Structures are given as structure tokens and as C-alpha cells.
């Protein structure tokens, strides 16, 4: 309880992602504009922009 | 018989194919898709990659 | 450290807004991603260790 600040107890949590072509599951929170047929528009399909 | 007229066509059909295959080879970045370097990295590490 | 746990997190809505607001002397260092852009990228599988 009296150790130096540099030697105080720490806790570490690491997160390892799998950002590849597999079906995404833990997608963050962000809307869902409707779809649109053939037209010069911007798309966002699960990260693919 | 008409092989020297096809060699000039195959050479151009090879340089144009060896050039579209270099758009999917990263040269030290996280990926070869430019739409993914700006969706995972803020704007000062991006300029580096 | 000698025997850690690996939670399988999947099928969720990952809102990383509640993460950076942690106890004092915290670090959000990311090796490959940026902590500010983690809100518009669909993650496939996330693994958490302790």
C-alpha cells in the first residue's frame, strides 16, 4: 500500500478484433439509411465505404 | 505465323494486367484498400500510411 | 497473468463511449486502430482478456 506510483498495482484489459471479410457481429451503433436502387450514391455496407 | 503482331498485343495485355494487380499489394500499410485506412485510423497516422 | 480469461464477445452493440470514462491514470493506446474512429466500423469478433 506504500509502493511508489510507478510500482502501484495496475489492471490491463486488451481487446483483439477480427476486422476482415467474415460476417460482422459486434458492429457499433450507427443508423441504417434505407436502400436505393441503381444511382450514383455513397454506400456503407458493414464498413465497406 | 502472325506471332510478332500478337507479341505486341500480349505485351500490352500484360503491362495493363501487371498494373491492376499492384492495387491490391500493400507496401507497408495495414491494407491495400484506401477506404479502410481512413475508417480505422485518425488523421495523423493515416497520412503516414 | 499466468492464467488469464478470454471472453467471447459477439452479437452485441459495441458502444465504446462508456470505456474511456474510466478510473484516473488510464490509457486508450491502440495498435493498428484509432480510439476515436471506433464507432463506424463493423467488427466481426472481439476478444477481451483480463
Swiss-Prot record, chain B:
Organism: Severe acute respiratory syndrome coronavirus 2 (2019-nCoV)
Protein name per UniProt: Spike protein S2'
Full-sequence portion shown in this chain: 944 to 992 of 1273
Protein's job: Subunit of the fusion protein that is processed upon entry into the host cell. Mediates fusion of the virion and cellular membranes by functioning as a class I viral fusion protein. Contains a viral fusion peptide that is unmasked after S2 cleavage. This cleavage can occur at the cell membrane by host TMPRSS2 or during endocytosis by host CSTL. In either case, this triggers an extensive and irreversible conformational change that leads to fusion of the viral envelope with the cellular cytoplasmic membrane, releasing viral genomic RNA into the host cell cytoplasm.
Residue stretches in coiled coil: 6-49
Upper lineage: Viruses, Riboviria, Orthornavirae, Pisuviricota, Pisoniviricetes
Phenotype when changing residue 39 to A: In strain: Alpha/B.1.1.7
Amino acid at each position: 500500500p506504500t509502493y511508489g506510483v510507478g510500482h502501484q498495482p495496475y489492471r490491463v484489459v486488451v481487446l483483439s478484433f477480427e476486422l476482415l471479410h467474415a460476417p460482422a457481429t459486434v458492429c457499433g451503433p450507427k443508423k441504417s439509411t434505407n436502400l436505393v436502387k441503381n444511382k450514383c450514391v455513397n454506400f456503407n455496407f458493414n464498413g465497406l465505404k | 505465323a502472325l506471332g510478332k503482331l500478337q507479341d505486341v498485343v500480349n505485351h500490352n495485355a500484360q503491362a495493363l494486367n501487371t498494373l491492376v494487380k499492384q492495387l491490391s499489394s500493400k507496401f507497408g500499410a495495414i491494407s491495400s484498400v484506401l477506404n479502410d485506412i481512413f475508417s480505422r485510423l485518425d488523421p495523423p497516422e493515416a497520412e503516414v500510411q | 497473468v499466468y492464467a488469464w480469461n478470454r471472453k467471447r464477445i459477439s452479437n452485441c452493440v459495441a458502444d465504446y463511449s462508456v470505456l474511456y470514462n474510466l478510473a484516473p491514470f488510464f490509457t486508450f493506446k491502440c495498435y493498428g486502430v484509432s480510439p476515436t474512429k471506433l464507432n463506424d466500423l463493423c467488427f466481426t469478433n472481439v476478444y477481451a482478456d483480463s
